[PDB]
Design a binder for this molecule. Structure first.
Ligand SMILES: *[C@@H]1O[C@H](CO)[C@@H](O[C@@H]2O[C@H](CO)[C@@H](O[C@@H]3O[C@H](CO[C@H]4O[C@H](CO)[C@@H](O)[C@H](O)[C@@H]4O)[C@@H](O)[C@H](O[C@H]4O[C@H](CO)[C@@H](O)[C@H](O)[C@@H]4O)[C@@H]3O)[C@H](O)[C@H]2NC(C)=O)[C@H](O)[C@H]1NC(C)=O
Ligand SMILES: *[C@@H]1O[C@H](CO)[C@@H](O[C@@H]2O[C@H](CO)[C@@H](O[C@@H]3O[C@H](CO)[C@@H](O)[C@H](O)[C@@H]3O)[C@H](O)[C@H]2NC(C)=O)[C@H](O)[C@H]1NC(C)=O
Ligand SMILES: *[C@@H]1O[C@H](CO)[C@@H](O[C@@H]2O[C@H](CO)[C@@H](O[C@@H]3O[C@H](CO)[C@@H](O)[C@H](O)[C@@H]3O)[C@H](O)[C@H]2NC(C)=O)[C@H](O)[C@H]1NC(C)=O
Ligand SMILES: *[C@@H]1O[C@H](CO)[C@@H](O[C@@H]2O[C@H](CO)[C@@H](O[C@@H]3O[C@H](CO)[C@@H](O)[C@H](O)[C@@H]3O)[C@H](O)[C@H]2NC(C)=O)[C@H](O)[C@H]1NC(C)=O
Ligand SMILES: *[C@@H]1O[C@H](CO)[C@@H](O[C@@H]2O[C@H](CO)[C@@H](O)[C@H](O)[C@H]2NC(C)=O)[C@H](O)[C@H]1NC(C)=O
Ligand SMILES: *[C@@H]1O[C@H](CO)[C@@H](O[C@@H]2O[C@H](CO)[C@@H](O)[C@H](O)[C@H]2NC(C)=O)[C@H](O)[C@H]1NC(C)=O
Ligand SMILES: *[C@@H]1O[C@H](CO)[C@@H](O[C@@H]2O[C@H](CO)[C@@H](O)[C@H](O)[C@H]2NC(C)=O)[C@H](O)[C@H]1NC(C)=O
Ligand SMILES: *[C@@H]1O[C@H](CO)[C@@H](O)[C@H](O)[C@H]1NC(C)=O
Ligand SMILES: *[C@@H]1O[C@H](CO)[C@@H](O)[C@H](O)[C@H]1NC(C)=O
Ligand SMILES: *[C@@H]1O[C@H](CO)[C@@H](O)[C@H](O)[C@H]1NC(C)=O
Ligand SMILES: *[C@@H]1O[C@H](CO)[C@@H](O)[C@H](O)[C@H]1NC(C)=O
Ligand SMILES: *[C@@H]1O[C@H](CO)[C@@H](O)[C@H](O)[C@H]1NC(C)=O
Ligand SMILES: *[C@@H]1O[C@H](CO)[C@@H](O)[C@H](O)[C@H]1NC(C)=O
Ligand SMILES: *[C@@H]1O[C@H](CO)[C@@H](O)[C@H](O)[C@H]1NC(C)=O
Ligand SMILES: *[C@@H]1O[C@H](CO)[C@@H](O)[C@H](O)[C@H]1NC(C)=O
Ligand SMILES: *[C@@H]1O[C@H](CO)[C@@H](O)[C@H](O)[C@H]1NC(C)=O
Ligand SMILES: *[C@@H]1O[C@H](CO)[C@@H](O)[C@H](O)[C@H]1NC(C)=O
Ligand SMILES: *[C@@H]1O[C@H](CO)[C@@H](O)[C@H](O)[C@H]1NC(C)=O
Ligand SMILES: *[C@@H]1O[C@H](CO)[C@@H](O)[C@H](O)[C@H]1NC(C)=O
Lengths: 113, 43, 132, 53, 53, 53, 132, 132
């Protein structure tokens, strides 16, 4: 029911630049408790998905200050500064308040040479 | 300036009506749809 | 994410779960029972009727010696006639709706037995208190 | 010279029943169950703020 | 479905009594034409085919 | 009963129990007027003249 | 035949029986207490008043430490001033109506003594719980 | 003279007294909670709401295992985070209003802990009753 729209499908970026990923929810994600449980997950080629940010604002565990997320309600955005080679992979946004939960469409980060 | 399909659908009716004063009456007119008025039976 | 457990903790969230698991969310329904011109009259009548139903249930529980408890162990032995089903079956396979359908026939018998057991226990307490 | 009552273009007036008296009588307001009425006994209370008594 | 009343109606207030007003219909400004509703022929045919199915 | 050592915050301007009093007084006023005579016939033309008496 | 015992088990059926025998049909009256435009208003007012009376009685019972019980033994000794009558007389000759007429004078005194006894017992429990 | 103690025994008479001393007049407020066309509708609505509030409070107390008691000792240890204040300070200097202002933040946490403790105690009772 909760359609998780993620744009752009591909997000080319040069090393050391800033890449912005936008992810929009069909409806409100704020739960009755007052917190919005929207998470961003990254999948490297040949590796399982890895949590990056939880609550859409809090950092998972000492993840780089480069990885910073912001937004509210319908619109949520994840920003990655000083892009590095280890950041290559598929970025997925995910909301976790309304059952069934859904994953984002997916954004493929592409580094530039 | 009615159309052929609206012939007789509207009636221009004049009647006596009570005013805000109990001893006075006013002659007024209104347009009524033919479905809202029934003839009672020249005039 | 909040997690699917909050759903289990919601009103009637365990209606489909096994009665053994549903026994851990009794307080949700118990609290929902007291949640809070012609239209006003009807609303007031509904509220009064809800209060009366809750009070009748509480009076019954007290009459069985189960006042203030959501789970109350009693002295009435279980008859195999009511249900020959095992314990594991009941508390790990069925749900409370299915169980209610099964034992709906004997409910009044069980209620009367509970009342008699509580009366016997009360008078035995009073008689041991006739002895101390 | 013709006149009309001032209210005739707004509404019709209801005549007060001649036996009913308009004299005010004291009325006391009382708190229901679970509620209390607190009275400020300060004689220089200006209507707002803390009331020590 | 698109429904319209193409007549440019005029409202007229008539004082029936104290505070009582009757809203009559005055002269219609312009031509007098029939009210009607429009639906798409193809859409209705498709929907009827589906309900028939 | 005097509440020793108790300090309370009062506000006569945001106070409730004044709106309730207003509503109750208005309702009483209306209730005392329901059974009385409605002066609909009094809305009639009057031929008035000065009282030089 | 149903038998005359069903009459004894009816509402107020034991009003004429000895209070000792009437003590075995308390639940009937206890349950009857909760049995279930101007006319609707009056009916609703009556129902609300009945609920309030029942709740006041239950609150009193709880205040005496007798919550959930129809027969509750207490720590208050019986004064001969209230009634010098024997036990056999009271529980095998008189009825509850006669007894109520006799002891109607001292009822408030007994209620106050019960309240004081429950308060003393509660604070003694709390003080022994200040010691354990 | 009647004496100033009757004032202490009045409704809210101990509101300014130390909570330790105010703990001896709980029954006054507890009983006041149940004291007893548009105007009639509003009065009836107020009475029904009061009854509902009282029943909700009683249901909460029962859910904590404190049914029928005005003072109920529990198994939940006191957290210093809620209040590092001493016992003498709390029960001989402050009043219940001040204390409520201080601990208003943690009230829901304490309520949840009480519910969890009562559930744990109930299931431990049922499990020891799975053993006897
Ligand atoms: C439903 O039926 C009612 C009938 O009750 C119609 O209302 C009448 O409509 C006619 C035509 O529109 C009105 O006649 C016109 O009245 C105008 C205003 O009247 C004043 O002026 C005249 C003198 O001209 C005075 O006698 C009168 O007391 C008023 O002071 C006039 O200005 C009009 O005159 C114009 O046309 C004539 C045509 O010959 C010219 O000679 C003039 O020079 C001038 O150009 C005209 O006389 C009549 O007054 C209306 N009566 C009422 C009571 O409203 C509704 O129109 C009709 N509605 C529908 C939808 O059919
Ligand atoms: C509204 O009220 C008026 C006033 O009563 C009505 O007008 C009156 O109508 C009657 C009958 O239609 C008239 O009587 C007739 O008069 C003619 C003309 O002299 C005469 O030839 C007939 O034989 C008959 O006597 C009366 O004169 C007339 N009065 C006035 C002042 O107009 C009117 O009919 C009522 N209805 C409407 C819609 O206006
Ligand atoms: C419902 O559908 C009918 C047609 O089936 C619509 O009638 C049409 O309405 C339009 C706009 O009101 C008319 O256009 C006019 O055309 C003339 C001649 O070209 C032009 O001179 C005018 O300036 C105006 O543009 C049209 O004539 C008329 N009839 C037809 C057969 O098209 C009707 O408006 C529709 N109504 C709704 C509510 O959808
Ligand atoms: C009922 O009325 C609505 C208007 O509220 C009609 O919708 C409008 O229909 C017109 C067609 O006359 C549309 O204009 C056309 O738009 C297309 C692109 O979609 C363009 O290629 C055409 O050249 C023309 O400009 C208009 O966009 C459309 N608007 C909306 C909001 O729907 C509707 O067609 C009417 N239906 C019937 C059955 O009469
Ligand atoms: C009812 O009539 C009265 C009297 O004509 C109206 O009050 C007067 O309105 C005129 C406006 O044309 C003012 O110039 C006068 O000063 C008003 N008189 C007074 C005493 O204030 C009143 O407005 C009418 N009510 C309605 C609803 O039409
Ligand atoms: C219906 O008729 C009225 C006539 O009163 C129109 O209102 C006039 O519209 C013109 C042009 O928009 C204005 O210049 C006038 O000032 C208006 N007069 C009034 C009294 O409002 C109205 O536009 C017509 N409606 C339609 C849909 O044509
Ligand atoms: C009767 O009273 C009327 C007023 O109701 C008098 O008429 C005039 O009223 C205006 C104000 O409305 C005054 O300024 C005038 O002084 C009044 N008199 C005149 C002559 O205009 C009227 O005079 C009074 N007397 C009679 C006999 O009608
Ligand atoms: C009525 O129709 C005629 C022509 O038939 C026209 O001259 C006249 O202006 C129309 N009236 C109105 C009010 O449009
Ligand atoms: C069980 O039910 C049977 C049949 O009604 C009855 O004879 C028996 O006494 C019952 N036993 C118990 C313990 O309820
Ligand atoms: C119930 O438990 C007994 C244990 O002796 C077992 O023999 C029996 O099969 C169980 N019931 C069912 C339906 O399997
Ligand atoms: C309960 O009784 C009805 C008849 O009143 C009977 O049809 C039904 O089978 C019974 N149910 C059980 C579980 O015995
Ligand atoms: C509707 O569609 C069918 C085919 O889908 C076509 O044969 C028919 O002519 C259309 N019109 C009507 C009025 O059925
Ligand atoms: C009154 O309150 C003050 C502070 O609020 C306190 O110091 C004093 O001891 C209190 N006195 C009594 C009698 O409670
Ligand atoms: C019994 O009543 C007498 C007279 O009121 C009183 O003096 C005595 O203390 C009472 N004793 C008990 C145990 O109630
Ligand atoms: C009460 O019992 C005593 C037992 O010693 C007896 O002497 C007395 O007569 C009895 N009361 C009456 C009224 O007989
Ligand atoms: C109870 O008190 C009344 C006076 O209030 C007295 O007439 C009556 O005799 C008393 N009853 C008993 C049993 O002492
Ligand atoms: C006391 O509160 C702290 C902080 O919330 C918590 O970590 C601790 O577990 C709590 N302990 C008890 C006994 O409630
Ligand atoms: C609380 O009691 C301890 C006892 O060791 C004492 O040291 C402390 O000063 C007391 N609290 C205050 C605020 O004095
Ligand atoms: C309670 O929380 C509020 C914020 O919601 C805070 O301003 C206040 O200081 C807190 N009170 C205590 C005693 O911690």
């Amino acid at each position: 029911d909760v359609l998780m729209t993620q744009n752009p499908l591909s997000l080319p970026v040069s090393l050391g630049d800033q890449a912005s990923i936008s992810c929009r929810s069909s409806q409100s994600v704020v739960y009755s408790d007052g917190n919005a449980y929207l998470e961003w997950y990254l999948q490297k080629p040949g590796q399982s998905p890895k949590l990056l940010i939880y609550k859409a604002s809090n950092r998972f565990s000492g993840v780089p200050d480069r990885f910073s997320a912001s937004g509210s309600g319908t619109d949520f955005t994840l920003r990655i500064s000083r892009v590095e080679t280890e950041d290559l992979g598929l970025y997925y946004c995910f909301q976790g308040t309304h059952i069934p939960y859904t994953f984002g469409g997916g954004t493929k980060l592409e580094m530039k040479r | 300036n009615i159309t052929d399909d609206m012939r007789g659908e509207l009636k221009n009716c004049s009647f006596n009506m009570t005013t805000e004063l109990r001893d006075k009456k006013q002659k007024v007119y209104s347009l009524f749809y033919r479905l809202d008025v029934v003839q009672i039976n020249s005039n | 994410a909040v997690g699917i457990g909050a759903v289990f903790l919601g009103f009637l969230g365990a209606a489909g779960s096994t009665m053994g698991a549903a026994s851990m969310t009794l307080t949700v329904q118990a609290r929902n029972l007291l949640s809070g011109t012609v239209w006003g009259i009807k609303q007031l009548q509904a509220r009064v009727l809800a209060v009366e139903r809750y009070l009748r249930d509480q009076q019954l529980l007290g009459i069985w010696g189960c006042s203030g408890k959501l789970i109350c162990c009693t002295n009435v032995p279980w008859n195999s006639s009511w249900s020959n089903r095992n314990l594991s079956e009941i508390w790990d396979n069925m749900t409370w709706l299915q169980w209610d359908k099964e034992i709906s026939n004997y409910t009044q018998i069980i209620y009367g037995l509970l009342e008699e057991s509580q009366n016997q226990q009360e008078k035995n307490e009073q008689d041991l208190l006739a002895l101390d | 010279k013709e006149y009309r009552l001032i209210n005739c273009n707004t509404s019709a007036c209801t005549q007060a029943c001649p036996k009913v008296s308009f004299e005010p009588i004291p009325i006391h307001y009382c708190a229901p169950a679970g509620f209390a009425i607190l009275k400020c006994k300060d004689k220089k209370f200006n209507g707002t703020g803390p009331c020590p008594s | 479905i698109n429904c319209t009343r193409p007549n440019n109606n005029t409202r007229k207030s008539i004082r029936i009594g104290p505070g009582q007003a009757f809203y009559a219909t005055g002269d219609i400004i312009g031509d007098i034409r029939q009210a009607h509703c429009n639906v798409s022929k193809a859409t209705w045919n498709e929907t009827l085919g589906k309900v028939v199915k | 009963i005097h509440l020793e050592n108790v300090t309370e915050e009062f506000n006569m301007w945001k106070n409730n129990m004044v709106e309730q009093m207003h509503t109750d007084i208005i309702s009483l006023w209306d209730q005392s007027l329901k059974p009385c005579v409605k002066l609909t016939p009094l809305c009639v033309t009057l031929q008035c003249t000065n009282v030089t008496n």
